[PDB]
Amino acid sequence: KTVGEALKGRRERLGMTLTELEQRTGIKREMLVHIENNEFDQLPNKNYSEGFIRKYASVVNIEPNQLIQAHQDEIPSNQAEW
C-alpha cells in the first residue's frame, strides 16, 4: 500500500469522515485528500508533506515515525537546505 492508502484505510476503519479529520488535525480537507492520494506535488508547500502525514497519523493512532520510514521513498522530505 502507499502511505496515503495506509492512512485512508485507517480513517475508514475508524468510521471517521474527512470533516472530522480536518477538525482534529487542522489540515484542510483538500490537503488531506491529496495526502490520501499521494498527491504531494499538489500541496502548496510540499515541504510540509511529512508534517501533514505525522499529524494525520497521530490523530488516527498510527505511530508516525515508523509509518514514514516504511514509506520514505514515496514521501518528499523537507528540503530545508538554505
Binding positions for Zn ion, rule: CB under 5 A: 30, 42
Q: Cβ(51)–Cβ(30) under 8 Å?
A: no
With respect to Zn ion, which residue has the nearer C-beta, 42 or 65? 42
Residue whose CB is less far from Zn ion, 12 or 30: 30
Name the minimum Å distance from CB 58 to Zn ion: 23
Minimum distance from residue 66 beta carbon to Zn ion (Å): 28
Contacts of 66 (CB under 8 A, 6+ apart): none
- Contacts for 45 with CB less than 8 Å, ≥ 6 apart: none
Which of residues 20 and 30 has its CB atom nearest to Zn ion in the complex? 30
